[PDB]
Design a protein around this ligand. Structure first.
Ligand SMILES: CCCCCCCCCCCCCCCCCC(=O)OC[C@H](COP(=O)([O-])OCC(O)COP(=O)([O-])OC[C@@H](COC(=O)CCCCCCCCCCCCCCCCC)OC(=O)CCCCCCCCCCCCCCCCC)OC(=O)CCCCCCCCCCCCCCCCC
Ligand SMILES: CC(C)=CCC/C(C)=C/CC/C(C)=C\CC/C(C)=C/CC/C(C)=C/CC/C(C)=C/CC/C(C)=C/CC/C(C)=C/CC/C(C)=C/CC1=C(C)C(=O)c2ccccc2C1=O
Ligand SMILES: CC(C)=CCC/C(C)=C/CC/C(C)=C\CC/C(C)=C/CC/C(C)=C/CC/C(C)=C/CC/C(C)=C\CC/C(C)=C\CC/C(C)=C/CC1=C(C)C(=O)c2ccccc2C1=O
Ligand SMILES: CCCCCCCC/C=C\CCCCCCCC(=O)OC[C@H](COP(=O)(O)OCCN)OC(=O)CCCCCCCCCCCCCCC
Ligand code: HEC
Ligand code: HEC
Ligand SMILES: [Cu+2]
Lengths: 218, 185, 283, 139
């Protein structure tokens, strides 16, 4: 519990205290304050493998019930967002999915597509950093990322974007990343740049090959 | 002139280098077997000896077919060459398809490349060999197409011979891998 | 006089280090002798210039002196065999590991810092039966009760007694590191999973003659701040050591436990320099 | 071709000796037993040398003396007609560009680029292999 949680943070001489401090006030050299974010920030940052670091997505070190402990520890220091649990004890998977899709897509195109894509692909930001692809992301991870606002990503509080709207956006994302394409081969999910390349390297090559076969050269 | 064959020397020394490549792979496999104590094929893995042996038999049969094609090639007969090499190509393609089917059935019951330490060494040891088999198939197709487009000469004969013992090298490498992975364990 | 023939080797603080230094100086003298002979031969043969009086008569064109070949191929075998014998002797006399040490330190290396453990103390006089923790190992790293942990603003200090048998058990959390104390004239790599890699992560020293502070470096390639993993070793007398161990069993920092025995609480050999960014930085 | 075979056979003998000695001396006296990496490497290096030396020995055992293997041979003994040596060709650089495309597609994980590189490699190797065998155009 909170006792092994303190050990989870404190005895993690490799992971936690060097960057943020045992007071969790934030070491000015390494890490930010870490005093007002709740269990949601911990569950997003650790389960996606982004936490304890030396920033791409990786596999998490701590797996077995020592994520929720550290989350409860961080939350007990100062209040904040919490992880949504099903009324059985687990973390919600299907219950987070909304039923309204048009509203979810409208809100996605308004608030989210500007950085990632129409269909959740990645995007390019300025001076290095980028916005990742949303296909390997989990549903609780979508919710917690939208709640906490990781690096360079805005913080979407629950009072400016309701939980119902968040569930609709989660539904839209999981439908846009899992739906088959009724047109043939998906050319990357971008616009006509792959299409022009395919035209030049497939269609025009076939046409010029047919011309070379039918006509003569001399 | 040309008492020894030059393309032969080249092919033999390159086959030696590829043997060293497979040496690297075998070392990777033999380490991490000494670390798995007990039921060293882990939790979900069970090899299918009822499907692993037929494909080996087809591969040896294809080697014999290729040697028969070489015999047909040493005398200036191109049509027997073509027949025997088409047969060899078909047997090799059947081997590749059987290996892919075993891959599918093994991946949909557990064992994967990112799943365990056994799956990774198994898939890397067998998939590179499969890639070499596909390369041999491409070589067969190119040799046949070349025989179609010009008069049959000793250079064509030499090409057939060097392709043949590349195939034989692939076959002996598979024999070693099979004996090591399905019987010795 | 032998300070110049040591090429910069510090005088050891350990009998194995003294033995290693003797072997080193002997080998250096031998190598200098051979090199001087070969340089002399080359510089002599560079006095066989083409003389203007030399007529249209090329030299003797001899080649192929056969017994000289056997002589010059049989003597280097002699030198290398002698050196190999003495090398084997010294390298067996340098990894002994008697079963009953007096102090056991658990060294842990992680990304750009160290951690020391004080696993067990057992003095041969008859005293000091200390012990470790192990309530938390839940898998190869060792956790103890009195641990000295280094940070980017304070350099970890390892307090050891003088004239005692010491043992080190080396473990790494993430990547390979190196444990080099130059005054030991010895170093060893710190590996993540030493047992599954068939490595001996345990080594002993018989005694430390001198007292005071000594520096320690990392000698691997660890990542960004590989050059910023220094530590310090403080060798005191067993009475100062019992005082320190008691003042540490009473919950107190390393610096306070050191100031309690009239010692400088911070590292005097090396200093915890910032995680620098450059000279022209906006501080 | 006696000296080539003898060279490779000497190499084979030394490599086999070193391999077996290292194998048994790691079976004993080692922290974990057989090392299983250097052993495999030495064994298959011995195999490399054995394959090459055996081929050269079989070639030499059924060949008459060549003008370059016989002293007191004359330069008019080698008079004749050598093989075929290719003049100008531009296919190697295309093969290299295709392989580099596939390698970049493997470095940056892009399966479409890997597939395009593989297709280009097949095409350029076809071009290299068929270069001196295409017949005149059939009009
Ligand atoms: C995802 C689907 C969505 C859309 C799909 C699109 C649909 C595509 C369908 C289009 C149909 C494709 C057919 C094109 C022409 C057919 C050629 C033919 O049949 O006659 C043989 C033709 C004979 O030519 P010829 O006019 O009688 O005489 C020419 C000289 O004799 C020869 O003398 P030369 O010295 O001038 O040699 C010319 C050149 C060979 O001739 C060429 O010039 C070929 C290149 C043409 C295109 C170049 C465009 C720029 C390249 C970039 O030599 C080479 O460079 C050797 C290259 C070998 C290529 C084989 C690689 C196979 C994989 C291809 C992918 O030889 C060929 O060109 C071989 C073509 C490949 C064999 C067919 C395989 C296609 C099967 C489809 C796979 C699926
Ligand atoms: C800036 C612009 C103007 C230039 C930058 C280009 C350059 C710096 C990039 C390559 C750098 C490279 C490592 C140089 C050294 C390598 C050299 C030795 C030879 C190999 C170079 C080769 C492999 C470069 C490839 C050229 C490349 C730019 C082609 C672009 C194709 C387009 C832009 C990709 C878009 C795209 C296409 C076209 C798809 O077909 C597709 C299909 C399915 C899913 C997704 C996609 C997709 O995203
Ligand atoms: C020939 C020359 C252009 C006449 C100039 C006369 C005079 C100087 C006019 C002044 C104009 C000057 C001032 C400005 C030039 C720019 C302007 C004119 C652009 C207008 C558009 C037009 C003129 C295009 C120019 C001609 C065009 C580019 C022909 C190129 C292709 C030809 C030569 C054979 C190519 C063979 C082909 C089958 C194999 C190549 C395969 C691929 C790699 C082609 C390259 C490629 C292309 C070409 C894409 O367009 C493309 C688009 C989106 C994604 C990827 C690609 C891509 O990879
Ligand atoms: C390096 C080559 C390595 C092996 C080659 C033999 C292939 C062996 C094939 C065995 C596949 C398998 O069984 O692996 C099942 C897994 C479980 O994935 P999952 O998590 O459960 O599901 C979620 C899936 N994403 O899927 C996979 O990783 C798919 C395997 C990827 C295919 C192999 C890549 C080929 C690239 C060729 C390199 C050419 C470069 C040339 C440039 C010089
Ligand atoms: C010095 C390396 C470092 C390590 C190791 C580290 N942190 Fe961080 N952490 C940071 C930095 C820097 C950020 C700011 C995010 C960024 O810069 O992209 C951050 C951000 C975070 C955030 C999100 C902050 C926010 O406002 O939402 C959380 C939560 C967090 N860390 C938790 C942890 C925990 C718990 C541990 C111990 C298991 C840990 N971190 C270990 C440096 C570190
Ligand atoms: C360009 C500003 C920006 C906006 C606006 C934005 N994102 Fe992000 N997003 C980012 C960046 C940058 C990251 C990378 C976070 C990191 O590396 O720690 C990210 C990360 C994420 C992730 C984590 C994916 C993973 O696999 O770790 C999810 C999920 C996500 N965003 C969803 C959303 C949603 C839903 C919206 C719309 C409400 C949105 N984002 C709006 C830039 C943005
Ligand atoms: Cu280091």
């Amino acid at each position: 519990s909170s006792a092994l949680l303190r050990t989870g943070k404190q005895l993690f001489d490799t992971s936690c205290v060097s960057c943020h401090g045992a007071n969790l006030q934030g070491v000015p050299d390494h890490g930010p304050s870490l005093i007002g974010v709740g269990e949601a920030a911990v569950y997003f940052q650790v389960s996606t493998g982004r936490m304890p670091a030396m920033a791409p997505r990786k596999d998490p070190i701590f797996d077995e019930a020592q994520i929720d402990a550290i989350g409860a520890y961080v939350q007990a220091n100062g209040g904040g967002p919490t992880v949504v649990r099903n009324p059985d004890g687990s973390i919600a998977t299907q219950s987070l999915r909304g039923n309204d899709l048009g509203r979810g897509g409208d809100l996605f195109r308004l608030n989210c597509a500007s950085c990632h894509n129409f269909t959740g692909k990645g995007g390019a930001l300025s001076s290095g950093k980028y916005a990742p692809d949303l296909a390997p992301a989990n549903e609780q991870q979508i919710l917690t990322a939208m709640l906490t606002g990781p690096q360079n990503m805005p913080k979407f509080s629950n009072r400016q974007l309701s939980f119902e709207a968040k569930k609709d956006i989660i539904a839209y994302v999981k439908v846009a990343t899992e739906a088959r394409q009724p047109g043939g081969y998906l050319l990357g999910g971008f616009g006509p740049a792959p299409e022009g390349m395919a035209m030049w390297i497939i269609g025009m090559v076939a046409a010029i090959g047919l011309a070379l076969w039918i006509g003569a050269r001399s | 002139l040309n008492r020894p064959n030059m393309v032969s020397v080249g092919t033999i020394v390159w086959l030696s280098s590829e043997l060293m490549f497979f040496a690297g792979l075998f070392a990777m496999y033999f380490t991490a077997r000494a670390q798995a104590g007990g039921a060293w094929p882990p939790e979900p893995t069970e090899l299918n000896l009822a499907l692993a042996v037929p494909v080996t038999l087809v591969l040896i049969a294809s080697s014999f077919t290729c040697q028969m094609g070489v015999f047909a090639a040493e005398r200036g007969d191109v049509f027997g060459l073509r027949r025997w090499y088409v047969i060899t190509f078909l047997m090799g393609l059947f081997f590749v398809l059987g290996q892919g089917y075993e891959y599918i059935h093994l991946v949909e019951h557990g064992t994967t490349i990112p799943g365990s330490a056994y799956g990774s060494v198994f898939y890397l040891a067998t998939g590179f060999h499969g890639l070499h088999v596909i390369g041999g198939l491409v070589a067969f197709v190119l040799l046949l197409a070349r025989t179609k487009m010009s008069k049959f000469t000793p250079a064509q004969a030499t090409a057939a011979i060097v392709v043949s013992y590349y195939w034989h090298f692939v076959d002996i490498v598979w024999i070693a891998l099979f004996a090591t992975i399905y019987f010795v364990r | 006089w032998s300070d110049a023939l040591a090429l910069g080797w510090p005088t050891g603080i350990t009998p194995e280090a003294k033995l290693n230094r003797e072997l080193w100086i002997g080998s250096v003298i031998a190598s200098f002798a051979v090199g001087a002979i070969v340089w002399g031969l080359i510089f002599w043969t560079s006095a066989f210039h083409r003389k203007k009086a030399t007529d249209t008569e090329l030299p003797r064109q001899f080649g192929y002196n056969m017994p000289l070949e056997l002589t010059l191929t049989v003597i280097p075998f002699l030198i290398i065999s002698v050196l190999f014998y003495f090398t084997v002797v010294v390298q067996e006399r340098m990894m002994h590991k008697d079963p009953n040490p007096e102090v056991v330190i658990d060294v842990t290396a992680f990304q750009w810092n160290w951690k020391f453990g004080y696993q067990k103390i057992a003095f041969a006089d008859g005293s000091f039966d200390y012990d470790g923790a192990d309530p938390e190992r839940k898998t190869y790293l060792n956790f103890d009760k009195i641990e000295t942990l280094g940070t980017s603003s304070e350099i970890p200090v390892l307090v050891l007694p003088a004239g005692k048998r010491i043992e080190f058990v080396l473990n790494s959390a993430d990547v390979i590191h190196g444990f080099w104390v130059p005054e030991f004239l010895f170093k060893r790599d710190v590996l993540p999973e030493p047992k599954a890699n068939n490595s001996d992560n345990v080594f002993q020293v018989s005694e430390i003659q001198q007292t005071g502070a000594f520096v320690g470096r990392c000698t691997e390639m660890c990542g960004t701040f590989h050059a910023m993993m220094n530590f310090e070793v403080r060798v005191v007398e067993p009475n100062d050591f019992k005082a320190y161990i008691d003042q540490r069993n009473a919950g107190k920092t390393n610096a306070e436990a050191l100031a309690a025995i009239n010692q400088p609480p911070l590292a005097i050999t090396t200093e915890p320099f910032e995680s620098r960014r450059g000279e022209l930085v906006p501080q | 071709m006696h000296i080539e075979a003898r060279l490779f056979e000497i190499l084979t003998a030394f490599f086999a000796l070193a391999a077996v000695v290292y194998a048994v001396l790691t079976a004993m006296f080692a922290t974990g037993g057989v090392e299983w990496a250097g052993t495999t490497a030495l064994v298959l290096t011995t195999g490399l040398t054995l394959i090459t030396g055996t081929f050269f020995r079989f070639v030499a055992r059924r060949l008459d003396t060549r003008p370059e293997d016989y002293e007191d041979a004359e330069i008019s003994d080698g008079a004749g007609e050598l093989g075929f040596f290719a003049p100008h060709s531009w296919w190697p650089i295309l093969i290299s560009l295709s392989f580099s495309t596939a390698a970049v597609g493997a470095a940056l994980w892009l399966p479409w680029l890997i597939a395009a590189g593989v297709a280009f490699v097949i095409t350029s190797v076809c071009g290299l292999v068929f270069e001196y065998y295409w017949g005149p155009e059939k009009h």
